[PDB]
Amino acid sequence: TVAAYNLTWKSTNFKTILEWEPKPVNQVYTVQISTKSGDWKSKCFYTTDTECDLTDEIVKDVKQTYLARVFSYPAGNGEPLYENSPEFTPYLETNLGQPTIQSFEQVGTKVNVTVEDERTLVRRNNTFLSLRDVFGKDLIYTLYYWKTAKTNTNEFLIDVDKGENYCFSVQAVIPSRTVNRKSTDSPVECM
Amino acid sequence: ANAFLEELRPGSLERECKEEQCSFEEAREIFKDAERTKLFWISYSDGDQCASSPCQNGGSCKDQLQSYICFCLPAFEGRNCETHKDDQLICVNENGGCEQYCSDHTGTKRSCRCHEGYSLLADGVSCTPTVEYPCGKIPILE
Amino acid sequence: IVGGKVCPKGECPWQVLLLVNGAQLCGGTLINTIWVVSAAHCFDKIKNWRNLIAVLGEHDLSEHDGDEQSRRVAQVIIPSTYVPGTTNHDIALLRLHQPVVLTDHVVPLCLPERTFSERTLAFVRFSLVSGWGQLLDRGATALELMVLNVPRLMTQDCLQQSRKVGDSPNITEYMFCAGYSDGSKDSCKGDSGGPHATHYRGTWYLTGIVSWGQGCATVGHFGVYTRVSQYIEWLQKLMRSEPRPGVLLRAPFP
Ligand SMILES: *[C@@H]1O[C@H](CO)[C@@H](O)[C@H](O)[C@H]1O
Ligand SMILES: *C1O[C@@H](C)[C@@H](O)[C@@H](O)[C@@H]1O
Ligand SMILES: [Ca+2]
Ligand SMILES: [Ca+2]
Ligand SMILES: [Ca+2]
Ligand SMILES: [Ca+2]
Ligand SMILES: [Ca+2]
Ligand SMILES: [Ca+2]
Ligand SMILES: [Cl-]
Ligand SMILES: [Cl-]
Ligand SMILES: [Cl-]
Ligand SMILES: [Mg+2]
Ligand SMILES: [Mg+2]
Ligand code: NA
Ligand SMILES: [Zn+2]
Ligand SMILES: [Zn+2]
């Protein structure tokens, strides 16, 4: 057995999947994750996969920093050989996903560009919440058109020109971040 | 892209892109600025990654750039919802639900036992005292 | 104990005070009515093996109440792999001539199975450590029982966060670390053989014994303890044993 290196957190909209290397040879792994001053939870038992889905654990309190580790075992079954991961607070690291313009109504001299609600994995009360239910006051959707606009909700009310017919493209942004602030742009829609 | 008597009317993407397959220049032409073409092409030539229906066990796929995002029904988890939570009742997983002792029977359900001083309740997972002063329990607190 | 707090009367009821000739020796854990667990390195300097008292019910040293029970130590089983002066194989089981009486302030601690303790109690972060030892390194002891909360750690991390000292032992699969390397809290001398009890689903178990450790609340270092999970079959085999000769018996291990 070898210690499992290169652990990277793949989080987008609170779906978190920790993945590491290498491809197991006479190995199986078991993942543990915990909140730095809490018990270690066991996930992905004796998996031949070089990745584990910690999604259900982080969405329990998305502001908590989590640490994880990958145990290496030998085929057939002192402490095991393992490797730790980086401290991962989701509410500040998880990526914002591609927004999608859901509609744009031209109400005369000004157009309204409604953004579709981005659903997260925080399965609260049955249905999954949206990124505004989670981030709230920290989320702002931006809109580039042909030039730029900003909203604290899902729609922009832009003042456009009569009979000109424009084009649009939105982006999810959390302005407080220093890194990982904005999402990838949306599929452009024109009038 | 060439289609004889259909190429007489000037540039319209609802026709040329949104009804038929827009080439790269077809798009640069309509948009002029390659950056305005960027915003468009970036996702126009990406593809619906959820076309393979990756989610399993009644999940819902949401597209993104060169990837997807599976939404799992309650008793499943995983990148594509492949993991059933109900087939994970083993002792390596939170002591298989047992309060005291857990023993696997991989091929049948795990069993829960107790420590000298206690007995298994009605549920098969919780333990209750037989003697007066059991181990591990502080009397003056209760 | 360094940086802890006084355990209220009745709350650390498996705390055994070990005496040799009326003097404060070590500590230990009641794991039933006759048997007590503690540390092998406490008996390195004993000469009077028939003058070993064990008290159950002690809270305050400087005073006497009816919750105290002095009983004398019949046997002291230690594994023959121990080498006095060293740290490794630091456990000791002790038979008590007459059996203690179970009351509110005198209650046992559960000795768990190897597996449940290797796969389940091993992963519960915080656990308590009890004792009347030094309140500081090189300092006064405690007249009242002092309890502390310490986080467990796997050995790889222990070796990684531990500042280097080239005279130190090894941390074997017979020990484990636990504590604050910032120099804020730690068990100390006079604590030994004391209970490192782990809470789990409403019942307290035994997972460690205050073995060794460099200094007390030393910056760069953790308190090393004994893996009571590696001595379960032994401790269980030996409690079924028919009494043998003198007070000290050196039992074979494995
Ligand atoms: C869509 O399907 C392909 C193959 O069927 C797979 O490789 C992708 O990961 C999935 O999203
Ligand atoms: C996709 O989303 C999940 C949460 C369920 O509502 C499924 O029925 C749906 O298809
Ligand atoms: Ca045509
Ligand atoms: Ca055409
Ligand atoms: Ca052309
Ligand atoms: Ca064109
Ligand atoms: Ca896509
Ligand atoms: Ca007293
Ligand atoms: Cl949203
Ligand atoms: Cl007696
Ligand atoms: Cl010490
Ligand atoms: Mg059309
Ligand atoms: Mg064309
Ligand atoms: Na310390
Ligand atoms: Zn008392
Ligand atoms: Zn007394």
Residue B36 in tokens: 């305005």
CA angle C47, C48, C54 (to 5 degrees): 120
Nearest alpha-carbon partner for A172 in A134, A144, A142, A149: A142
Phi, then psi, of C116 in degrees rounded to 5: -55, -25
Report the Cα–Cα distance between both ends of chain B, in Å, rounded. Answer: 83
Question: Is the C-alpha dihedral spanning C187, C191, C192, C194 positive or negative?
Answer: negative
For chain C, what is the radius of gyration of the CA atoms?
17
Q: Which residues contact C29 (CB under 8 A, 6 or more apart)?
A: C14, C15, C16, C36, C37, C38, C109, C193, C194, C195, C197, C206, C209
Contact predicate B82/B56, CB 8 Å: yes
What is the rounded CA–CA span in Å between residue A69 and residue A58?
15
What is the rounded CA–CA span in Å between residue C123 and residue C107?
25
| Size of chain C in residues | 254
Question: Is the C-alpha dihedral spanning C23, C28, C29, C34 positive or negative?
Answer: negative
**Interface residue of A185, A188, A191 to substitute, partner B, most B CBs within 10 Å:** A188
Taking any CB pair shorter than 8 Å as contact, residues of chain A touching chain C are 32, 34, 37-40, 42, 78-79, 82, 84
Residue C20 in tokens: 């040799």
* Helix H or strand E segment including A144: strand A140-145
Q: What is the resolution of this structure in A?
A: 2.8
What is the rounded CA–CA span in Å between residue B15 and residue B17?
6
CA of B52 to the centre of ligand 1 (A): 5
Q: Where are the domains of chain A?
A: 1-93, 94-191
What is the rounded CA–CA span in Å between residue A46 and residue A48?
7
Q: Where are the domains of chain B?
A: 12-142
Torsion of CA A114, A116, A122, A123, to 10 degrees: 110
| Full set of structural domains in chain C with CATH | 1-12+109-229 (2.40.10.10), 13-108+230-243 (2.40.10.10)
Residue nearest to atom 8 of ligand 2 (CA): B58
**CA neighbours within 13 Å on the CB side: how many for C114?**
9
**Interface residue of A36, A37, A39 to substitute, partner C, most C CBs within 10 Å:** A39
Buried b (16+ CB within 10 A) or exposed e, C33-62: bbbbbbbbbbbeeeeeeeebbbbbbbbeee
Return the SS3 of A99: coil
Residue B28 in tokens: 């640069």
CA distances from C96 to A60, B73, C189, C247 (A): 49, 58, 24, 11
| Size of chain A in residues | 191
Give the nearest ligand 1 atom to B68 CA. Answer: 11
What is the rounded CA–CA span in Å between residue B125 and residue C177?
32
CA angle A119, A123, A126 (to 5 degrees): 110
Which of chain B's residues have a Cβ under 8 Å away from the Cβ of C11?
Answer: 138, 140-141
CA distances from B101 to A46, A139, B126, C20, C231 (A): 22, 47, 10, 38, 18
Among the partner-chain residues A32, A39, A42, the one whose CB lies closest to the CB of C124 is A39
Nearest alpha-carbon partner for B69 in A97, C177, C133, A27: A97
Q: Known binder of ligand: residue C186?
A: yes
Contact predicate B97/B89, CB 8 Å: yes
CA of B14 to the centre of ligand 12 (A): 5
What is the rounded CA–CA span in Å between residue C143 and residue C161?
33
Contact predicate A43/A57, CB 8 Å: yes
What is the rounded CA–CA span in Å between residue B109 and residue B126?
16
Q: Which amino acid is at C146?
A: M
Residue nearest to atom 5 of ligand 1 (CA): B52
Contact predicate A147/A190, CB 8 Å: no
Residue B18 sits at the chain A interface (C-beta within 8 Å): no
Q: Is the CB of B52 under 6 A from ligand 1?
A: yes
Return the SS3 of B58: coil
Residue nearest to atom 7 of ligand 1 (CA): B52
Return the SS3 of B42: helix
For chain B, what is the radius of gyration of the CA atoms?
31
What is the rounded CA–CA span in Å between residue B121 and residue B27?
71
Residue A97 in tokens: 């996903």
Contact predicate C1/C146, CB 8 Å: yes
Nearest alpha-carbon partner for C145 in C6, C45, C15: C6
Is C67 considered catalytic here? no
Which CATH number applies to A1-93? 2.60.40.10
Which of chain B's residues have a Cβ under 8 Å away from the Cβ of A54?
Answer: none
CB contact under 8 A, C108 and B133: yes
State the nearest Cα–Cα gap between A86 and chain B, in angstroms: 21
CB contact under 8 A, C107 and B133: yes
What is the rounded CA–CA span in Å between residue A122 and residue A136?
14
Residue A78 in tokens: 């002192």
Q: Which residue has the tokens 């793949």?
A: A10
The class that CATH gives domain A94-191 is mainly beta
Among the partner-chain residues C107, C108, C116, the one whose CB lies closest to the CB of B101 is C116
CA angle C34, C37, C39 (to 5 degrees): 145
CA angle B13, B17, B19 (to 5 degrees): 100
Is C41 considered catalytic here? yes
Among the partner-chain residues C123, C154, C173, the one whose CB lies closest to the CB of A39 is C123
Chains that touch A (3 or more CB pairs under 8 A): B, C
What is the rounded CA–CA span in Å between residue A32 and residue B92?
11
Q: Which of C59, C89, C90, C187 is catalytic?
A: C90
What is the rounded CA–CA span in Å between residue B96 and residue C130?
30
CB contact under 8 A, C155 and A79: yes
Residue B70 sits at the chain A interface (C-beta within 8 Å): yes
Q: Which residue has the tokens 């649009």?
A: A168
CA of C76 to the centre of ligand 8 (A): 24
| Size of chain B in residues | 142
What is the rounded CA–CA span in Å between residue A149 and residue A144?
6
Describe the crossing of helices B34-44 and B24-31 by its angle, rounded to 10 degrees: 140
Q: Is the CB of B21 under 6 A from ligand 1?
A: no
CA of A133 to the centre of ligand 9 (A): 8
Which of chain C's residues have a Cβ under 8 Å away from the Cβ of A79?
Answer: 154-156, 173
Q: Which residues contact B99 (CB under 8 A, 6 or more apart)?
A: B112, B114, B125, B126, B127, C201, C202, C203
Q: Is the CB of B24 under 6 A from ligand 2?
A: no
Classify strands C248-251 and C69-79 as parallel, antiparallel or unpaired.
parallel
What is the rounded CA–CA span in Å between residue A154 and residue A117?
7
What is the rounded CA–CA span in Å between residue A101 and residue A104?
8
Say whether A94-191 and A1-93 share the same fold. Answer: yes
Contact predicate A69/A32, CB 8 Å: yes
CA of B16 to the centre of ligand 13 (A): 5
3-state secondary structure chain C: CECCEECCCCCCCCEEEEEECCEEEEEEEECCCCEEEECHHHCCCCCCCCCEEEEECCCECCCCCCCCEEEEEEEEEEECCCCCCCCCCCCEEEEECCCCCCECCECCCECCCHHHHHHHHHHCCEEEECCCCCCCCCCCCCCECEEEEEEEECHHHHHHHCCCCCCCCCCCCCEEEECCCCCCCECCCCCCCCEEEEEECCEEEEEEECCCCCCCCCCCCCEEEECHHHCHHHHHHHCCCCCCCCCEEEECCC
* Helix H or strand E segment including B26: helix B24-31
CA distances from C241 to B73, C4, C80, C92 (A): 56, 38, 16, 15
Contact predicate C39/C25, CB 8 Å: no
CB contact under 8 A, A37 and C156: no
